[PDB]
Write a protein that binds this ligand. Structure first.
Ligand code: HEM
Ligand code: HEM
Ligand SMILES: [Cl-]
Ligand code: NA
Ligand code: NA
Ligand code: NA
Ligand code: NA
Ligand code: NA
Ligand code: NA
Lengths: 184, 186
């Protein structure tokens, strides 16, 4: 399955414990989050908002980087990773008009995104969802999903601080940081 | 509406008359007499439609600044009055392609296949638009909808371009290709 839909509302297995608009306009506060797989999923009862994205092919990663990620990255769904974060991100529109080399330079050569992220594995599990090429309008360009143990929360926060200080983050115009704890 | 999404509606309606449907690789689409290029998503299917193909224009995945600047200078506008021929060429690439890393695909696409280098040789004759399908969902029949416009005097040239690209390393990964030729109504 490539398509995932994140429903914020009154029902779901993830309890929302924090929501902050890091950049741009806030999203409505909600108590629970549900994640559904596939292209024809139902809207859960009591849904306030729905965000959809699709996993996709690599846009920047080179083979040598891929091999490092494969060696180090954890799986989604670990028993002990009871904390999660959903971080919807929208880029500045100018980003999308840049050429491929220009974006790769900002992303990795300047911002060191992968290099930094690698330093937080195996603590942090991740999944990247793309929104901008779906058939239907989405308010964000990416839905980023993370999972980690409670004891790794401060490491996750440090990762975010490092990325938010990067050149790449100058191009982030909306970013919502939603923190979750899995239901018992 | 989003200015990036288009639906190609094969059927009994539209400004484009279908003159040929070439089954280049893999199974063809049902024969159609006309083509409509609609903004956005189409539902329900208009009377007379046999099929709908949707795609979205998107950001560059491979081109570098030096290439882009060449393209911007040389490429013609879409919608030129004299460019009464068009081609709609749906393309699918195989699963192996999509699992390759970015450097591997860029190497195939340009360093080996010379896609852009070749295509530049056919500007300003040929106007083009690339539409992406694979991030609409897992169940689109093609990965790309490619659209071209040219004058009838440039049709032989366009055919030469196609033969060059179809001989390239990149095309080793193409597992479906249909080539539909159109002429604009008067
Ligand atoms: C946990 C460690 C992390 C690692 C190893 C990592 C790795 C990566 C990799 C490999 C890509 C490129 C994918 C491609 O080639 O298409 C990527 C893209 C991306 N990542 Fe991360 N990442 C991490 C954390 C984060 C965090 C915490 C955020 C959000 C706050 C984030 C936001 C993004 C975005 C928005 C993209 C899309 C490309 C772009 O930057 O324009 N990543 N990441
Ligand atoms: C007329 C001259 C042509 C030029 C200048 C040209 C140029 C380009 C450029 C710059 C890209 C890369 C876009 C990016 O960075 O995302 C591209 C992609 C593509 N072109 Fe062409 N092209 C031409 C003709 C054709 C023809 C005739 C076909 C089909 C038979 C074709 C099929 C494609 C496909 C399928 C892609 C997507 C590649 C992928 O993302 O894997 N092109 N072209
Ligand atoms: Cl991207
Ligand atoms: Na994207
Ligand atoms: Na997308
Ligand atoms: Na495009
Ligand atoms: Na593109
Ligand atoms: Na692509
Ligand atoms: Na590609």
């Amino acid at each position: 399955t490539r398509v995932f839909t994140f429903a914020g509302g009154e029902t779901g297995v993830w309890r929302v414990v924090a929501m902050n608009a890091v950049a741009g306009a806030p999203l409505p506060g909600i108590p629970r989050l549900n994640v559904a797989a596939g292209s024809v999923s139902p809207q859960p009862p009591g849904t306030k908002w729905l965000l959809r994205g699709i996993t996709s092919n690599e846009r920047y990663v080179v083979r040598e980087e891929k091999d490092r990620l494969v060696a180090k990255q954890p799986s989604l769904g670990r028993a002990e990773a009871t904390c999660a974060a959903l971080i919807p991100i929208r880029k500045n529109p100018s980003w999308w008009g840049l050429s491929q080399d220009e974006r790769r330079k900002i992303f990795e050569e300047q911002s060191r995104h992968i290099h930094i992220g690698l330093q937080y594995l195996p603590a942090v599990a991740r999944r990247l969802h793309h929104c901008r090429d779906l058939g239907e309008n989405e308010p964000f360009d990416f839905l980023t999903w993370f999972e980690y143990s409670p004891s790794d929360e401060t490491a996750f926060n440090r990762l975010l601080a490092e990325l938010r200080a990067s050149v790449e983050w100058q191009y982030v115009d909306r970013e919502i940081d939603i923190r979750l704890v899995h239901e018992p």
